[PDB]
Each structure stands twice: as C-alpha cells, then as structure tokens.
Design a protein around this ligand. Structure first.
Ligand SMILES: COc1ccc(C[C@H]2NC[C@H](O)[C@H]2OC(C)=O)cc1
Ligand SMILES: [Cl-]
Ligand SMILES: [Cl-]
Ligand SMILES: [Cl-]
Ligand SMILES: [K+]
Ligand SMILES: [Mg+2]
Ligand SMILES: [Mg+2]
Ligand SMILES: [Mg+2]
Ligand SMILES: [Mg+2]
Ligand SMILES: [Mg+2]
Ligand SMILES: [Mg+2]
Ligand SMILES: [Mg+2]
Ligand SMILES: [Mg+2]
Ligand SMILES: [Mg+2]
Ligand SMILES: [Mg+2]
Ligand SMILES: [Mg+2]
Ligand SMILES: [Mg+2]
Ligand SMILES: [Mg+2]
Ligand SMILES: [Mg+2]
Ligand SMILES: [Mg+2]
Ligand SMILES: [Mg+2]
Ligand SMILES: [Mg+2]
Ligand SMILES: [Mg+2]
Ligand SMILES: [Mg+2]
Ligand SMILES: [Mg+2]
Ligand SMILES: [Mg+2]
Ligand SMILES: [Mg+2]
Ligand SMILES: [Mg+2]
Ligand SMILES: [Mg+2]
Ligand SMILES: [Mg+2]
Ligand SMILES: [Mg+2]
Ligand SMILES: [Mg+2]
Ligand SMILES: [Mg+2]
Ligand SMILES: [Mg+2]
Ligand SMILES: [Mg+2]
Ligand SMILES: [Mg+2]
Ligand SMILES: [Mg+2]
Ligand SMILES: [Mg+2]
Ligand code: NA
Ligand code: NA
Ligand code: NA
Ligand code: NA
Ligand code: NA
Ligand code: NA
Ligand code: NA
Ligand code: NA
Ligand code: NA
Ligand code: NA
Ligand code: NA
Ligand code: NA
Ligand code: NA
Ligand code: NA
Ligand code: NA
Ligand code: NA
Ligand SMILES: [Sr+2]
Ligand SMILES: [Sr+2]
Ligand SMILES: [Sr+2]
Ligand SMILES: [Sr+2]
Ligand SMILES: [Sr+2]
Ligand SMILES: [Sr+2]
Ligand SMILES: [Sr+2]
Ligand SMILES: [Sr+2]
Ligand SMILES: [Sr+2]
Ligand SMILES: [Sr+2]
Ligand SMILES: [Sr+2]
Ligand SMILES: [Sr+2]
Ligand SMILES: [Sr+2]
Ligand SMILES: [Sr+2]
Ligand SMILES: [Sr+2]
Ligand SMILES: [Sr+2]
Ligand SMILES: [Sr+2]
Ligand SMILES: [Sr+2]
Ligand SMILES: [Sr+2]
Ligand SMILES: [Sr+2]
Ligand SMILES: [Sr+2]
Ligand SMILES: [Sr+2]
Ligand SMILES: [Sr+2]
Ligand SMILES: [Sr+2]
Ligand SMILES: [Sr+2]
Ligand SMILES: [Sr+2]
Ligand SMILES: [Sr+2]
Ligand SMILES: [Sr+2]
Ligand SMILES: [Sr+2]
Ligand SMILES: [Sr+2]
Ligand SMILES: [Sr+2]
Ligand SMILES: [Sr+2]
Ligand SMILES: [Sr+2]
Ligand SMILES: [Sr+2]
Ligand SMILES: [Sr+2]
Ligand SMILES: [Sr+2]
Ligand SMILES: [Sr+2]
Ligand SMILES: [Sr+2]
Ligand SMILES: [Sr+2]
Ligand SMILES: [Sr+2]
Ligand SMILES: [Sr+2]
Ligand SMILES: [Sr+2]
Ligand SMILES: [Sr+2]
Lengths: 73, 56, 237
RNA sequence: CGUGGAAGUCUGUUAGAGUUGGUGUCCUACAAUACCCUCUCGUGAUCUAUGUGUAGGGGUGAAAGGCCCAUCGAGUCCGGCA
RNA sequence: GUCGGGUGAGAACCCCGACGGCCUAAUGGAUAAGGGUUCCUCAGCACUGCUGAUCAGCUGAGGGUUAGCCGGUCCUAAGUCUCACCGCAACUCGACUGAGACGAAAUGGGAAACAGGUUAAUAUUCCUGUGCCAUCAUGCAGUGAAAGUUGACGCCCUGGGGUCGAUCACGCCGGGCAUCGCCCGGUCGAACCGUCCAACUCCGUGGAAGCCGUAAUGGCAGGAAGCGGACGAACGGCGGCAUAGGGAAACGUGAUUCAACCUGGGGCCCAUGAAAAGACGAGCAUGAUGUCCGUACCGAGAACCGACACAGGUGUCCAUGGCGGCGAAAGCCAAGGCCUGUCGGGAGCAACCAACGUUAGGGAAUUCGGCAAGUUAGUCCCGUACCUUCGGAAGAAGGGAUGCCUGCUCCGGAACGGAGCAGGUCGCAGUGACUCGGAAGCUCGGACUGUCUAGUAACAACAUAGGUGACCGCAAAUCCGCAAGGACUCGUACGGUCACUGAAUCCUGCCCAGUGCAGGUAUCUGAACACCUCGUACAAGAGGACGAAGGACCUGUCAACGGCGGGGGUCUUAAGGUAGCGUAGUACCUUGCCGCAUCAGUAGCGGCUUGCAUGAAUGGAUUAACCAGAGCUUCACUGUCCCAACGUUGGGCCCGGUGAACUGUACAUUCCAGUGCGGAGUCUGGAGACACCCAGGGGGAAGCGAAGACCCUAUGGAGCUUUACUGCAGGCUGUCGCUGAGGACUCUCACUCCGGGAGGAGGACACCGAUAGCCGGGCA
RNA sequence: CGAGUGGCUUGCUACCUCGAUGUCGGUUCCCUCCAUCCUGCCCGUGCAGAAGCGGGCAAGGGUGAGGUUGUUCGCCUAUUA
RNA sequence: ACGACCGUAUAGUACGAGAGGAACUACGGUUGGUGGCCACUGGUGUACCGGUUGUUCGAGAGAGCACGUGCCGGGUAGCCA
C-alpha cells in the first residue's frame, strides 16, 4: 500500500504504514447494526455508511486493545 | 539577490508622514507615533539633552 | 555569548506561541450544584487541533452546547450523564468516590472542580485502584501512584484516538504540518552544530560537546542544557 | 485484464522560484552584485502580495557567526567627546 | 529604418503618406502601491533630453478629476492603541484583567446600475434611455417574528448543467483578389422584470432474495428499479426590456469543444482548513431623502525604488486571438502598440577584440580536469543487464519506423478527435526548420525531497524521518520579567521540555580510576541567627556548644565527558580494542607490495595490510534509490589539440556633434655598463640621439589604484574559551520577619491554592522581604 | 689530503622595500651563458673492422611527442643525430 | 637562411679465422627552419543556384521571417595550407 512512497524511506517505515493503512481501510463491524460499513473520516473519527453513526475510536483502528478493556468492567 | 540596488525596488511602503502635531514628516503611519516630537507616545514634547553638546 | 534557544522561548514571541486563535475549546468538566440531573446527547464528533485526538460535541438538557473530551466508543445519539448519581457507563463523568475500583478512567481532576488535568492525551488512561473516606489512589499513565481527593471528578473510559504514536511520520513534511498546530519551534538544530557564542556545546574543529552532558539542577538558564540532572545515562548497566 | 489516480514522484525556460559552470561579457559598469548561455526546483518542509509581531548583548537563525534598510564576531543616530 | 512631402530662420531623428521592420503573459488592455499635476491646450527653447529638435515627462501661462447604486466609509482577522487597575525611585516604561476604540481602497465580509451618447482633458459620476437598493412618510395588507437559514470557508481526483471565445455548415451584407474561385470582415442588442430546472434531499406508490447504478466509489426488505409528487441552480435558456441603443449594410440559423458561472460524486489529515457586521426568515402603493471623502495622469528599458529619462528591482486580472503541437512550448501571424532598449556619416570596412558559422586528414594528442564546444534528441514498434529496500534500476542498453498523394477500415454521438490498411510517389535528408537525453561502468560521501554563507564557499555542512538518553503528575519540568506578571498552555506522559545520533538492513564489545550528574552517608568537615563561657558597669573582641546544603567517604551511571597502552610468559591510570573496516577525504614512511588497465598510469579499482595516529549513536559496517557533490575507465562526438584558414554581426579606423575620469615634485630622446641605502630616464664613463604626428601590442617607469591582510612591536581594541584573576545574576540550603493556639507532634486564625457559591485542600509551612554558606564563564 | 672557480641548491645575515615591487607550477615570446647532449674538426685507446670509452677546439643550428603527478624535481613509453 | 637525418652506388668491398662490416666520392629523398605563390589538391566562400520544413501574403506564381544563411546539397573569384 506504500507504492506512493516509491524507492524512498526504507523497509520498516513503509512496511508499518502499509500494515496500519491496510487494517484502517478494512471492512469494520458497526456498533449500531452489525454491518461491515465503517470508514475513517479523520484522526480518530469513524463513521458507518449504513446508519450514519459517527463515532470515536483509535487513530487508525476503530477499536484499540485498551478500548476493549473498558467493557470488561 | 544583492542587498544593494536590487533590494531597493521593493520600497513602496509608506511609513513616515506629515505630523498633525509638529509638522515634520516623522509620523509613522503604522506605529502611530512621531519620531520627531513624540506625538502618539507622549503628551510632553520629545526633547533630549544629547541633541546639543553637553555644555550648551 | 548570545542567549540560547531555550531562553528565546520564554519571551513568548510569535514563533514560540501556540496558534490559540485556531483552537476549538478548553475541554473542562461541566459545573453541577448537586442532584446529578444533568445529561446530554452527542451531536457531532470533531477533530481537536490542540491535541490531534477527537472531541465530542454534546448538547445538554438546559440548552448548553459544549465540546467534551471524547473517550473511546462515544458516538452520535449516545446519552452521557454528568453528576454524583451518574450511570457507570463509558463517557460519563462522576467523582472518583462513586466510580468502582479497577475501572479505567480519564480526564482526572487534581483539585476537585478544576475541570480535569490528568490522562487527556490520545489513548491513555488512569487506573482507579484503592478507596477510602479520605483518599482515592489513581495510577496515572506514567506509572505513578497519585493519591487524590475522592471528590475529584473523572470520565470513564480510555481517551479516544489510541495508537497515534504507532505509525511513523515517515517524512519531514508530515512533522512540519503537526508542528504548525503546536507551540513549538521546529526543526531542531543541534547545539553541537552551533557556534560557541550560541550554545554551551557550540564550537570546536569537529562536532562534540565541550564538557560532560549531565548538568546540575542548580545550573542557570543559559547553561542548563543537555542531560538535565540525570540520575543515570545510557541503556546498559 | 481493466478501473482508479496516489506521490515532500518524474519530464518541463507554463507561471513562478533558485543560482551550477563558463572562473565568458562587464569591472572609471547599464548595474556600489549587472548581462548572456548553461544549470536546479516547479502539488509542496512550495512560491508570492498586503497586513501584522519579535529590537541591539537584544531579535531572528533547517547554524553560514547568516540576517536585523549598500551598516553585523554585537545595527543606526546623537551625546559622553576636544 | 528608407523615398517623397508638411511646418520652420534652421529638420537624420517634429508631423503626413508609402515602402520596410520590431513587440504576442508583452513593447498590447485594465489596475495596486508608490509618484503628485507629470494629464489637456496655448506659447516657447535659457535649462533638462547620451547628437539635433520646430518635439517633449523641459520652461511659462491657462484649463482639467462631477457618483444613493465603483472604492472609502460599516464589519470583524493576526494584532494595535486608550482608559481603569497594578508595578516601578519615576515616567513618554511594563505584563495581566476589565471596558472602549483601532486594524482589510488591487486581494477577507458587504444593500443597490446597466446600455448608449458626449469632451482638448472626466465619466457605471455628466447627458439620454431603462433599471435597482436603503431609510423615512402617507395609505393598504399584516399581526405573525424567531426558531432557523445565510454571511461562511482546506487539499487532491472527477461527473453533470452551461455562457463568452474559437472552429465547422449554410444564408444575407461589405471588402479583397484576379488563369483558378478562393480569402477577410460583419451579420449586434445590457442591467433588470418574468418565467424554465438539472444536481442534492425528502414524500407517496411499488415490491426487487439479485437486481439498480457510476468515469470511479457504490445502492437496497432498515425497501432496489419503475411511476407520481414536494423542495429546489446558473453571470445559463426563454419572453419582455427593444417602432431603446448601435450599424454604411445585412441587421443569421444550426452545431461541436466549451473559460466564466451553477450543481454533484469520490479520496486525504499524528495537518481539520476565520470572524463579525449584515441578509433571509418577513407583503404592496405613492412620495421624500440618499450627505461626507477618493475620481486627472503614469503604473515603467523616461511618470514607482535604485543620486540618472539606470539593461536592476516592483503585486494583481486579461491563461480561450489564428497556424502549429501534448502544450499558457518553439517558430510565424493578427488585434493593439511601436520604429524612444533614442546620436549619426564614411572606408569589401586592415591589425586587434566581442558574439558567432564552416573547416580536409587525425580524433582529447589539448588541460589539474573534455573547461569550452560538440554529440544525442520528438513520436511509435521491438527489446532491455548487474543490483534492489521488490517501489525501482528503465527512456538501461540495442534495433527498426517516421514525408507527400489516392482510396479506405476500426473506436466514438461527434470533433476541424484518435488508432490503423492498400496503392502511388519525391529528396542527400520526412521530429526535413523549430521543438527535441549523448550512453555505459567502477569508487568516495550524504540515505532520500528540503537548508545555507543577500555580495568569491550549494558541499561531504544544516535539516529530516528513524534510533537513544535526560527532566517533569501540572501549585510540574523548561524558559521570560526589576516588579506587576508571562511563554509553553483552549496543552497533561500516546504529553513537551532538554540533549545526542541521523532512512532502512546487520550491529553497537570492554572500562565508573579522573571529570560530570545523581543517590546514600556511622563518622569527619561545614556559615550566620539564637544559646553557653571569658572579656567590657555596656560594646568591640576571643572561645564553646549545635550543625543545613555542600565537601570528605560510599554507591549508581558511558547511546555522560571520555579511554581501550608500555612491558613480559604484570605496569601506568579503570580497562587494554571485540564485530567490523583498513595505505582510508584517517597511513608518516609512500609513487607501500601484488594484480587489473595503458606503449607508458605518483591517478583509479581489487587484493594484501604490522592501523606514524581505524573502530562501534565521539556510532561501526553496508547499502537499492537520489545528486549542478569528489576521483577513475569505456563507446560516441568534436577546432581542446596537431595548426591554423576563410566568413558573419557589433566595435575598432576616418568625418559631424556631444564630451568625462584616472593621474601630475621637478626635469625628461634614450641605451649599455658602472656607482649609489646593495633593484638609476636624472649620478659616472661611454654609446646612440633632427623635430612633430598616426596606429599597435603592453618591455620599463621596482606603472596606476589601497597609510600590508602576512610578521613583529604597543604595559592597543574586540569576539570567543577555561579547573586564569576578581566579581555579578541564578539555583540549593540555614536563620530572622510575616507568624498564630495546644526534638518529635497536634490544631486554626493569618497566609496560599481549588471551588460560581456553599465550601474544600494546605497551613504557620509555602510565597514574599532580609541575611548567611555552597554551586555558579549563564553574565561583566 | 691540499688549492680553487661559480653563484644553479641549501644555510647564514638582517643592508633595501611593510602610506604593498602580486605566489608556486605551467604557458607564451624574446635575448643570453658554456661547465657541449647531437652536429663540424680533432688527440688517445685496453684503436683490426663495426660499435664504443676518454680527452681537446667549438655556442652556427638543434635538443622533439607522450602516461602518473598542481608539481619543480623525478619515474615510465615509444620515437631521435 | 639554412640545420640535420635516411637511402642507393662505392660494397657484402677494405678490415677480420669467422661472426660481422666501414670510408672518400656521386647521387635520390625525408625532417626542422626560412621566404614566396595559388596552375594542382584541400578549406572557406551569411556572392550565387537548387532542394525542402513551419508560418504569413486567398490558391498559383512569386516572396518575408525562423540571428543576424531556417535547415539541407553544390559552389565562382579572392583569401588561404
Ligand atoms: C611569495 O610570498 C610573497 C611574499 C611577499 C610578497 C610581497 C612583497 N615582495 C616585495 C615587497 O617586499 C612586497 O611587495 C608587495 C607587498 O607588493 C609577495 C609574495
Ligand atoms: Cl511530535
Ligand atoms: Cl477607487
Ligand atoms: Cl458522479
Ligand atoms: K613590504
Ligand atoms: Mg481543557
Ligand atoms: Mg508555528
Ligand atoms: Mg537536528
Ligand atoms: Mg559552524
Ligand atoms: Mg559559552
Ligand atoms: Mg559526527
Ligand atoms: Mg559527535
Ligand atoms: Mg511579511
Ligand atoms: Mg566558524
Ligand atoms: Mg506644441
Ligand atoms: Mg482618459
Ligand atoms: Mg531611456
Ligand atoms: Mg576537422
Ligand atoms: Mg601535456
Ligand atoms: Mg560542458
Ligand atoms: Mg463508428
Ligand atoms: Mg580515495
Ligand atoms: Mg543531501
Ligand atoms: Mg550530517
Ligand atoms: Mg555567496
Ligand atoms: Mg547545490
Ligand atoms: Mg531524532
Ligand atoms: Mg525521538
Ligand atoms: Mg591499495
Ligand atoms: Mg559504546
Ligand atoms: Mg601600514
Ligand atoms: Mg593574524
Ligand atoms: Mg583584549
Ligand atoms: Mg487564582
Ligand atoms: Mg569573559
Ligand atoms: Mg610590476
Ligand atoms: Mg670548453
Ligand atoms: Mg646563439
Ligand atoms: Na490495480
Ligand atoms: Na548564473
Ligand atoms: Na537539490
Ligand atoms: Na549592540
Ligand atoms: Na533621436
Ligand atoms: Na433568468
Ligand atoms: Na523536489
Ligand atoms: Na570513571
Ligand atoms: Na578512538
Ligand atoms: Na572555430
Ligand atoms: Na608598458
Ligand atoms: Na573581534
Ligand atoms: Na667562490
Ligand atoms: Na609562472
Ligand atoms: Na652550438
Ligand atoms: Na611528465
Ligand atoms: Sr537578477
Ligand atoms: Sr513592497
Ligand atoms: Sr503609545
Ligand atoms: Sr526631555
Ligand atoms: Sr484548563
Ligand atoms: Sr476554570
Ligand atoms: Sr563544542
Ligand atoms: Sr552496555
Ligand atoms: Sr515534483
Ligand atoms: Sr522539473
Ligand atoms: Sr569557480
Ligand atoms: Sr557589456
Ligand atoms: Sr563584478
Ligand atoms: Sr559560451
Ligand atoms: Sr564625539
Ligand atoms: Sr494600463
Ligand atoms: Sr536654439
Ligand atoms: Sr504629453
Ligand atoms: Sr473600521
Ligand atoms: Sr473587497
Ligand atoms: Sr461539459
Ligand atoms: Sr482613470
Ligand atoms: Sr522592468
Ligand atoms: Sr499590427
Ligand atoms: Sr535624443
Ligand atoms: Sr558550406
Ligand atoms: Sr584526456
Ligand atoms: Sr593528457
Ligand atoms: Sr533508436
Ligand atoms: Sr550511514
Ligand atoms: Sr539566499
Ligand atoms: Sr542506521
Ligand atoms: Sr564517576
Ligand atoms: Sr584486532
Ligand atoms: Sr591600446
Ligand atoms: Sr668557451
Ligand atoms: Sr659529439
Ligand atoms: Sr624549484
Ligand atoms: Sr620525489
Ligand atoms: Sr651504405
Ligand atoms: Sr653477413
Ligand atoms: Sr534572413
Ligand atoms: Sr536537427
């Protein structure tokens, strides 16, 4: 996904951007319904194209490992 | 770019203008203060002892 | 010599100031008398230029439209409650006394009613541990055990925008854009690359500091550079 | 295979910005930093106008002791001063 | 520029005509700033004008700028000021907090104007026609009225609507050309009023289990398509405006591609892309009012800044004129502008110089070095290595094609769009000019884009992402202020401060003795106040007791300053150099030795390598990609060279006019020798020497230009450093005051902080004032 | 071992110039010296010849092209009387 | 204003066991330098003639511009090596 970076920057810098942007562009399950229609609107801002539910999540993930710990207690 | 002749070409800004108080072309239209009589800065007229030789 | 960069900072000139006129809101907790009967609906989720994390727009029962420090999971339509008898749900603000032990909390107050000081950055959280009639022990994001007044308010959940530090900036331009939204002079020229006149580490035929880097706490501004009062340096040992 | 159209991405005297070599021309100059060809950048940490801020042991400085009105390893003016 | 002509006392350069040229993002059009009358007219030539002048931006005298609807004015932006408050010895000084005001003329927001006519000079301002806005008054309607909407918004890609323009087709009007019958121009008509509505959104119907849809993404039983409907755009269409205006005339119609303008879809952010006034919401008639300021002209190779009529510098809009082509490219040409990048005349016009063309054979032999020049070149097809971070390398390399003419095919709705086929055919040459890469390899450096010495350094230097260490829980760390106060901070450890290293990959050894920092500390040392002894009718003073930080001492720490040897089969001073790399941009010896390559190679590359004096974030090694960075090799090319020639343009030379400067103790026609403070046109001896003038290239005048930058000297200066001398800020710490009640402790009432408040936290501490000790190139 | 000549190297001195006599190497253009490398004429020879070695007179003319290196110097190549 | 060299004949000779191997003299040429000249060869030749690309003058004809010839081909005199 880091083909835009060309022959520049190096492995680790463009491998970590490719991995993070791959998981960001993925089909995510919505907290309102159950559909795989959540897209990123900006830094930390997520929204479902189905029910128009705009929510807060991680910067690049819609759910962080720490955000899932909150539900437990 | 040279600091001399080619840098003089950009000089079309008006700063020092005719003062309402003293009549000298020293009223800075951006600072709103006169460099000659001190209009805009002080009620008292700008004067200094160094404007003349010490014993005069 | 000449005053160092750290001394130019304090003067508070344009170059060193934060673009305050471009900032949205000072995210503080709402002021309630007692009774808890203050709740609101989340209207929008906005980007906050001050902290690079998202912020939630909430419209309260008494007609007050204020931006609040958004925890993770808070979305449009959701109802948030602020007060003593508030529900123990993520996104609600209640004093540390009413919040159960072992629950991740954010935007914690130092002194009761200050509006929140601790655990506000992207994805961080404070952990409430021990309870008492006098003290509420909270474990801050640095790992420090902070003894606080149980009357200090806090919001349940971790702060939104988690994992921001995970992705590299890759290029200088990305750093440039972030820095233009902060109160920092960037790029950073090393003192060792400067002249003797400009910095304690300046000068020489080759680049190296002129004395050891570990400076005393008692050092005056102009000399306090490098490793400030270091207990140790290095990785090993 | 196509679609898509990313990029401190490439070519480019587009506009614009910059200034490598010629150690060419000039060197009582057209010019107290100019001319010509050549050359670099040209969607970005880009360029630019106007307005606005920071002032002299002080600013400002991607740091060359660079720049702060042809003035800088401490501006300029007058005074100390004959 | 040239030939005629005009005016004039006078004409190369003032004016008319013709012919010939120049400018095309400008040499055209409109403007901002800035200038300030430079604008127009008349009269002039003493001044100014690179010559001349009858001309003029010159001299003199007159004249010239007309606004409800174009700016200003109003609003608010970064931010500024004033007042109050507070500080300060004090203020014309100073941060905060309040209130007020100021802050946008091209280019932020914003009530309303269009078309034509007119002057020597103004013009959406005057005049004609038409229109529009606001306020107020009267009348009618209305009692709604403020919720909401608008003002009002980033970057990238893109669809749809659509005007001007451009082009095509055909018709009409006018012109041009004259083998043809082609070519050029025109064919007009606003604001405004009215009306139409695509996109988006929504409603009803419908009932898709696979269909609907796009350039693309996409949409749906949470209800798809289809059908009906609500809301709803243009600076656009349409009608009026218009027996208005304009044109000599005709006074068109259709189309394509479509700037403006309108309206959607998509993607990006560790970046989130103003505010306020105002408007809408919220009708209509008639009438009144609409003041004040700007308005000329230039806007540049002569109206601005640069002392100049300066080859410099200086913002915006016209980015859609034609051919050309990918093109806002070249070249050529319109519209418009100009012959003022303002001295001319003459000589085949010599030498010499600047720019430049062409040179046979050789082909880098030139030189520090291919510096300079040249070679290559557009487009299509074939084809393409090592290495690599798999992106790239790559337009690698190499090979072929390329025009015109006739007739056609395919894609598309179509283009005056694109891709091909067959036949014919011309030249030395078909990207025919123009436009337009020379290619390959080895090594060094820095990873990359970026930054820099305005004016001799663009680089390997700075920056960078990335790596790392340090400080700090926010009444913080760091920093500014004398103070009142302030930045960081609308910030809170995924933060931000202070430093080092400098992408990725593989790694980053050993040393804490010294120095630095930090922690600890029985004991030692450690100031002042208070306390005790002596002394003094008191005081000075002497001693003691207690003992803070600090020091001694101990420990931790090197991705902290740094270190990693001599000797022998330990010693200094802690350790004794590990991976690697290595004759290095680090190797003195040194052109090290061997090999490659060349006829020959102090070069370059590889290997070896005992390294004068490599080595691991003072980072070591390595490395794809990138580079106006340093070195080397090859192919190609060539006037760099052998070795120079001829030519072209501007000078140079002669003539008219204009007209400086540098320099000057005097004398001066010198030459060879000598002498002399040892580097003489001038002294001595000889030699030579008739005067003046033109052109030349620069041998001499230790030529001209600058009170030597080097070096030394001066009880000269400045910047910089430090364990130099002496001090000054600052930090830490004790003590006294503020400061209170019952060697450890409780409390609350000062005081501080949090809270809107109630009240909460803290608390005689802290802050502050004073003093004492320690640290203290931060500063003098 | 002794005696000298030169003024190209180096060193020494501090006379001249610090109100300035522009550096090294190279280049280009001119003149000169002889202690002669070649060429002319000679003497000797461990001179058969050929090719040399050594010496004398002699400055008319000539003494060139290249590879490394900024180099002067020097090393190297092929030509050359 | 000439310097120098190579070659042929002398001669496979003198000399010498052989190997090897001269000279006087007479000739031909080369090289460097020098002065002059252009029939010949070569260069130039923005005199001139032709071809041809783009654009403008409507086409044609005939022309302008494309840096002081648009480019390409040929090239007289002169000047030159
Ligand atoms: C090579 O090193 C050099 C040293 C000094 C000089 C100059 C001096 N030489 C003659 C005079 O003493 C002086 O002349 C000047 C100053 O013009 C030149 C070169
Ligand atoms: Cl950051
Ligand atoms: Cl105006
Ligand atoms: Cl669309
Ligand atoms: K001197
Ligand atoms: Mg806040
Ligand atoms: Mg900033
Ligand atoms: Mg840096
Ligand atoms: Mg430096
Ligand atoms: Mg210092
Ligand atoms: Mg370094
Ligand atoms: Mg270093
Ligand atoms: Mg500015
Ligand atoms: Mg320096
Ligand atoms: Mg007149
Ligand atoms: Mg006019
Ligand atoms: Mg002029
Ligand atoms: Mg040739
Ligand atoms: Mg040579
Ligand atoms: Mg070159
Ligand atoms: Mg078709
Ligand atoms: Mg090297
Ligand atoms: Mg670089
Ligand atoms: Mg570096
Ligand atoms: Mg420079
Ligand atoms: Mg550069
Ligand atoms: Mg870093
Ligand atoms: Mg870091
Ligand atoms: Mg080697
Ligand atoms: Mg180490
Ligand atoms: Mg002197
Ligand atoms: Mg010196
Ligand atoms: Mg001094
Ligand atoms: Mg307070
Ligand atoms: Mg000092
Ligand atoms: Mg001289
Ligand atoms: Mg002799
Ligand atoms: Mg001679
Ligand atoms: Na694809
Ligand atoms: Na240049
Ligand atoms: Na660059
Ligand atoms: Na100063
Ligand atoms: Na003239
Ligand atoms: Na309309
Ligand atoms: Na770039
Ligand atoms: Na140590
Ligand atoms: Na070392
Ligand atoms: Na030439
Ligand atoms: Na001379
Ligand atoms: Na100095
Ligand atoms: Na002698
Ligand atoms: Na020389
Ligand atoms: Na001779
Ligand atoms: Na040599
Ligand atoms: Sr320039
Ligand atoms: Sr300006
Ligand atoms: Sr003032
Ligand atoms: Sr006074
Ligand atoms: Sr706050
Ligand atoms: Sr508050
Ligand atoms: Sr240093
Ligand atoms: Sr270690
Ligand atoms: Sr680019
Ligand atoms: Sr480019
Ligand atoms: Sr140079
Ligand atoms: Sr010139
Ligand atoms: Sr110059
Ligand atoms: Sr040139
Ligand atoms: Sr004085
Ligand atoms: Sr104009
Ligand atoms: Sr006259
Ligand atoms: Sr005029
Ligand atoms: Sr205003
Ligand atoms: Sr405006
Ligand atoms: Sr369209
Ligand atoms: Sr005007
Ligand atoms: Sr100009
Ligand atoms: Sr014209
Ligand atoms: Sr003139
Ligand atoms: Sr020719
Ligand atoms: Sr060469
Ligand atoms: Sr060479
Ligand atoms: Sr080819
Ligand atoms: Sr590296
Ligand atoms: Sr610059
Ligand atoms: Sr690295
Ligand atoms: Sr230590
Ligand atoms: Sr070793
Ligand atoms: Sr001369
Ligand atoms: Sr002699
Ligand atoms: Sr001889
Ligand atoms: Sr020498
Ligand atoms: Sr040597
Ligand atoms: Sr013979
Ligand atoms: Sr024989
Ligand atoms: Sr011509
Ligand atoms: Sr060509």
């Amino acid at each position: 996904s880091s083909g835009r970076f060309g022959a520049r920057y190096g492995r680790v810098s463009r491998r970590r951007v490719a991995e993070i942007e791959s998981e960001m562009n993925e089909d995510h399950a919505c907290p309102n319904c159950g559909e795989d229609r959540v897209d990123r609107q900006g830094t930390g801002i997520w929204q479902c194209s189905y029910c128009d539910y705009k929510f807060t999540g991680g910067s690049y993930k819609p759910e962080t490992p720490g955000g899932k710990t909150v539900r437990r207690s | 770019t040279g600091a001399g002749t080619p840098s003089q070409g950009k000089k079309n800004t008006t700063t020092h203008t005719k003062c309402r108080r003293c009549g000298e072309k020293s009223y800075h239209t951006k600072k709103k203060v006169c460099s000659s009589c001190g209009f805009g800065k002080s009620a008292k007229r700008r004067d200094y002892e160094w404007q003349s030789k010490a014993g005069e | 010599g000449r005053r160092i960069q750290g001394q130019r900072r304090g003067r508070g000139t344009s170059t060193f100031r934060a673009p305050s006129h471009r900032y949205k809101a000072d995210l503080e907790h709402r002021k309630v008398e007692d009774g808890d009967v203050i709740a609101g609906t989340v209207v929008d989720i906005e980007h906050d230029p001050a902290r690079s994390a998202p912020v939630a727009a909430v419209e309260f029962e008494d007609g007050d439209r204020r931006l609040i420090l958004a925890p993770e999971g808070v979305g449009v339509g959701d109802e948030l409650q602020v007060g003593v008898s508030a529900e123990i749900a993520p996104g609600n603000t209640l004093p540390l006394a009413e919040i159960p032990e072992g629950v991740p909390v954010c935007n914690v107050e130092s002194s009761p009613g200050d509006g929140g000081k601790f655990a506000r950055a992207s994805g961080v959280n404070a952990q409430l541990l021990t309870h008492d009639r006098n003290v509420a022990v909270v474990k801050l994001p640095s790992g420090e055990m902070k003894r606080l007044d149980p009357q200090c308010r806090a919001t349940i959940g971790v702060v939104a925008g988690g994992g921001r530090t995970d992705k590299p900036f890759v290029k200088a331009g990305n750093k440039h854009h972030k820095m233009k939204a902060r109160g920092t002079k960037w790029p950073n020229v090393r003192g060792v690359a400067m002249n003797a006149v400009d910095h304690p580490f300046g000068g020489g035929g080759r680049q190296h500091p002129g004395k050891p880097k570990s400076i005393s706490r008692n050092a005056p501004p102009g000399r306090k550079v490098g490793d400030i009062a270091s207990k140790r340096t290095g990785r090993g040992g």
